[PDB]
Design a protein around this ligand. Structure first.
Ligand code: HEM
Ligand SMILES: N[C@H](Cc1c[nH]c2ccccc12)C(=O)O
Length: 344
């Protein structure tokens, strides 16, 4: 039904199938060492597969990203136990910088590496903790990542579609359907992840580390390129400084193609701004304008159906939540209100 997902899932699978360092059996031993708080052991295990003579010349994006995944779980782990990985693992930093170069991504593991680029099988899936709650956490992202990527494409396409065209309503309805996957992710996360286990056992693995003289944030669904989609959709011309800073903070962590989309739309009115302007010019007596606006409103509804429950999810875990969440929620409500005002 959501036919556009396939190509994105296939691209994810290529990295997930790659094991260029033959590290699968080794990384699977990491959870045990974490449980034992065995820092020398963790370093020792990493040094069993960490390249010491640079990267094999034949590697492309896929191998480099897969290598970063496998090294990456050791990064979050060492930091969890209170150590900067670059400080305790000799020769690690040059490898991380080389892998960053090869992938055009930060010099550590990101959400992509630990979720959609991470194989799904029990005898292959990499994990910090080996806990079922972590497996559920990763599953929650896998539910919606490909759909979100498809949704970014649909949003960019919709940008150039006239509100006067029947296509506007059709594409918006299609966009809504892909975004529904985000809602499904939160339902799954709320049902299957223990807040206590998340806060006490998982959260400590996602702390920032220092590489190349700056700090890089750990993996999180906050790195999902939803903020890029919404930049195009409603946020590009926002004067909200904190919101602007949020986007600029996470921009480095998303795929190069999405950083390019972000740049393309920064100096432009957002989709909503163009659509509402077109509606005032043409009038809502045009049925395609009415239907377009109504369909657009449903896109905002689904975004709110992700964002509101997510805030509850976050609050429950953190009661064992960051102000930015509430602030973004308020901005989203205001965006929807603009669409609703245009229909009155
Ligand atoms: C128990 C599970 C979860 C917890 C505790 C949690 C917590 C948080 C927190 C505290 C933030 C604010 C930024 C930060 O401090 O990192 C955030 C942001 C965010 N999270 Fe989650 N999260 C969870 C699950 C998820 C899931 C399953 C998804 C989607 C698959 C998701 C998507 C996002 C997105 C897109 C943001 C950026 C803000 C926004 O768009 O509203 N989170 N999360
Ligand atoms: N920081 C929150 C919660 C979180 C931390 N690590 C992961 C991994 C996968 C999904 C969510 C999270 C966030 O970014 O959503």
């Amino acid at each position: 039904t959501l036919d556009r997902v396939g190509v994105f899932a296939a691209t994810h699978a290529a990295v997930a199938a790659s094991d260029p360092l033959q590290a699968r059996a080794l990384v699977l031993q990491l959870p045990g060492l974490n449980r034992n708080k065995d820092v020398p052991g963790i370093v020792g295990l990493l040094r069993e597969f960490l390249p010491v003579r640079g990267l094999p010349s034949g590697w492309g994006f896929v191998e480099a990203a897969a290598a970063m995944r496998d090294i990456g779980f050791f990064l979050g782990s060492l930091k969890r136990h209170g150590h900067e990985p670059a400080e305790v693992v000799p020769g690690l930093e040059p490898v991380l910088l080389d892998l960053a170069r090869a992938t055009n991504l930060p010099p550590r593991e990101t959400l992509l590496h630990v979720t959609v680029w991470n194989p799904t099988a029990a005898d292959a899936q990499r994990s910090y903790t080996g806990l079922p709650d972590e497996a559920h956490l990763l599953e929650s992202v896998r539910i919606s990542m490909a759909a979100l990527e498809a949704a970014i494409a649909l949003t960019v396409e919709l940008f150039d579609v006239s509100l006067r065209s029947p296509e506007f309503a059709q594409r918006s309805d299609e966009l809504e359907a892909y975004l529904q996957k985000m809602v499904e992710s939160i339902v799954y996360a709320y049902r299957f992840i223990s807040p206590q286990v998340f806060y006490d056992e998982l959260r400590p693995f996602y702390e920032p580390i220092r590489v190349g003289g700056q700090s890089y944030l750990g993996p999180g669904a906050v790195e999902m390129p939803l903020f890029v989609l919404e930049h195009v959709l409603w946020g590009s011309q926002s004067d909200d400084q904190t919101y602007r800073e949020f986007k600029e903070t996470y921009l480095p962590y998303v795929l190069p193609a999405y950083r390019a989309v972000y740049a393309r739309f920064s100096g432009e009115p957002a989709l909503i701004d163009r659509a509402l302007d077109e509606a005032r010019a043409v009038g809502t007596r045009d049925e395609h304008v009415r239907a377009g606006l109504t369909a657009l409103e449903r896109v905002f509804k689904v975004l709110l159906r992700f964002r509101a429950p997510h805030l509850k999810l976050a609050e429950r875990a953190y009661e064992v939540a960051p102000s930015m969440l509430g602030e973004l929620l308020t901005l989203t409500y205001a965006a929807r209100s603009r669409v609703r005002a245009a229909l009155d």
